[PDB]
């Protein structure tokens, strides 16, 4: 249940990022002071063990902006990139 | 922000370089408002970059 | 994967911009319906911290 | 496809100059329209005819986007400074738009409504609104009767809006 | 009629058909202004017939 809610939350966070730039700040608060839900949410932020197209796009730039914010301990980023690389008839 | 830092850096190095600035003065090249409008109309609301 | 967000229609916001100028000149003390609508949507939302 | 932002920049400058004028005079748009019709070939060849048709439909488009204030102006002062820019418009409707931007001996729903909206706007903004409306719609029997002939076909549309 | 002919002809033959007109008269179907917007907002400028 916190996995699906977290995907709806990251969707909203990314489309706020689009309408803006510079990291929706609800999320940056939740990061430092809701670490449990930060990691239950940050699994969906790295649920793109999927084709990363040639050009940077929403998800790409969103996660680049986070790793510039010095969040994403490099363990989960390495994981992300690795998973990404992928008669009767 | 945008695609490769080297393309970005290349553009800025060219922009700062002097002989580009000395060329931009005597100018048919100085991008008339009408020419500006022709390029801005050429581009779409579809693939923006902005 | 929801992969950012799409636009749809920058046309229809122009079709609004028209009706806005029209009613506005038709009036020209009383207060606009926009701020009313804004209050209704903010109220119909959840009041939580989530 | 390229331009819907630049057309918004145009709306901006239009409304600006509207308020600068509210601070009698005739609009530069109709001048530009006259210059381009003049600088077209006066030849009657289908090439020139179709080019003229394209140019007028685009004129109609630009005026439907921009406010209905550029047609009738705004806040008709007195009966002496009357029919300024409307004769400018009537000349265009008689010379050109009657040729191409018509159907069935009549005008377009869009531009008819755009005009009538502008008319009621400025008239109701001014005093003696019924009398001044009756004045300009009596002038229309002499200067541009297409408007009346259009407004007979497009009445089931306008009557609710105008009421 | 079920012609496996062209789509343009098919659509317009269906329009002209009376029984479709009789159906539009029972107004759960008449395409409100709001339903109109909810579709027109769906579509993009990117790829477009018009």
Curated annotation (Swiss-Prot), chains B, E:
Location within or outside the cell: Nucleus; Cytoplasm
Paired cysteines (S-S): none
Signal peptide location: none
Post-translational modification comment from the UniProt entry: Phosphorylation is required for the formation of the nuclear complex. Not phosphorylated in cells derived from groups A, B, C, E, F, G, and H.
Involvement in disorder: Fanconi anemia, complementation group A: A disorder affecting all bone marrow elements and resulting in anemia, leukopenia and thrombopenia. It is associated with cardiac, renal and limb malformations, dermal pigmentary changes, and a predisposition to the development of malignancies. At the cellular level it is associated with hypersensitivity to DNA-damaging agents, chromosomal instability (increased chromosome breakage) and defective DNA repair.
Oligomeric form and interacting partners: Belongs to the multisubunit FA complex composed of FANCA, FANCB, FANCC, FANCE, FANCF, FANCG, FANCL/PHF9 and FANCM. The complex is not found in FA patients. In complex with FANCF, FANCG and FANCL, but not with FANCC, nor FANCE, interacts with HES1; this interaction may be essential for the stability and nuclear localization of FA core complex proteins. The complex with FANCC and FANCG may also include EIF2AK2 and HSP70. Interacts with FAAP20/C1orf86; interaction is direct.
Protein function: DNA repair protein that may operate in a postreplication repair or a cell cycle checkpoint function. May be involved in interstrand DNA cross-link repair and in the maintenance of normal chromosome stability.
Record-given protein name: Fanconi anemia group A protein
Organism: Homo sapiens
Gene name for this UniProt entry: FANCA
Whole sequence portion shown: 897 to 946 of 1455
From Swiss-Prot, chain D:
Cell location: Nucleus; Cytoplasm
Domain of life: Eukaryota
Entry PTM: Phosphorylation is required for the formation of the nuclear complex. Not phosphorylated in cells derived from groups A, B, C, E, F, G, and H.
Effect of residue 69 to F: In FANCA; benign
Main function: DNA repair protein that may operate in a postreplication repair or a cell cycle checkpoint function. May be involved in interstrand DNA cross-link repair and in the maintenance of normal chromosome stability.
Quaternary data: Belongs to the multisubunit FA complex composed of FANCA, FANCB, FANCC, FANCE, FANCF, FANCG, FANCL/PHF9 and FANCM. The complex is not found in FA patients. In complex with FANCF, FANCG and FANCL, but not with FANCC, nor FANCE, interacts with HES1; this interaction may be essential for the stability and nuclear localization of FA core complex proteins. The complex with FANCC and FANCG may also include EIF2AK2 and HSP70. Interacts with FAAP20/C1orf86; interaction is direct.
Disease (UniProt): Fanconi anemia, complementation group A: A disorder affecting all bone marrow elements and resulting in anemia, leukopenia and thrombopenia. It is associated with cardiac, renal and limb malformations, dermal pigmentary changes, and a predisposition to the development of malignancies. At the cellular level it is associated with hypersensitivity to DNA-damaging agents, chromosomal instability (increased chromosome breakage) and defective DNA repair.
Protein name (record): Fanconi anemia group A protein
Source organism per UniProt: Homo sapiens
Gene: FANCA
């Amino acid at each position: 249940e916190p996995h699906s809610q977290a995907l709806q939350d990251v969707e909203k966070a990314i489309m706020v990022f689009e309408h803006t730039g510079n990291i929706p700040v609800t999320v940056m608060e939740a990061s430092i002071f809701r670490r449990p839900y930060y990691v239950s949410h940050f699994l969906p932020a790295l649920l793109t063990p999927r084709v990363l197209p040639k050009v940077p796009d929403s998800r790409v730039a969103f996660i680049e902006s986070l790793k510039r914010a010095d969040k994403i301990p490099p363990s989960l980023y390495s994981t992300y990139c690795q998973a990404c690389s992928a008669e009767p008839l | 922000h945008l695609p490769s830092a080297d393309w970005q850096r290349a553009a800025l190095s060219l922009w700062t370089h002097r002989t580009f600035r000395e060329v931009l003065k005597e100018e048919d090249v100085h991008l008339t408002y009408q020419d500006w409008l022709h390029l801005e109309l050429e581009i779409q609301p579809e693939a923006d970059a902005l | 994967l929801v992969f950012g967000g799409r636009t749809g229609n920058e046309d229809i916001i122009s079709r609004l911009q028209e009706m806005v100028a029209d009613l506005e000149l038709q009036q020209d003390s009383q207060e606009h319906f926009l701020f009313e609508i804004f209050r209704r949507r903010l109220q119909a939302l959840t009041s939580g911290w989530s | 496809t390229g331009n819907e932002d630049i057309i918004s920049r145009l709306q901006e400058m239009v409304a600006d100059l509207e308020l600068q004028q509210d601070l009698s005079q005739e609009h530069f748009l109709f001048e530009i329209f006259r210059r381009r019709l003049q600088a077209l070939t006066s030849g009657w060849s289908v090439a020139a005819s179709l080019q003229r048709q394209r140019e007028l439909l685009m004129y109609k488009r630009i005026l439907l986007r921009l406010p209905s204030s550029v047609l009738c102006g705004s806040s008709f002062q007195a009966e002496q400074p009357i029919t300024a820019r409307c004769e400018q418009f009537f000349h265009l409707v008689n010379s050109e738009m009657r040729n191409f931007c018509s159907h069935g001996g009549a005008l377009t729903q869009d531009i008819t409504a755009h005009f009538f909206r502008g008319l009621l706007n400025a008239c109701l903004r001014s005093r003696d609104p019924s009398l001044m409306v009756d004045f300009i719609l009596a002038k229309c029997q002499t200067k541009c009767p297409l408007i009346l002939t259009s407004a007979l076909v497009w009445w089931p549309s306008l009557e609710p809006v105008l009421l």
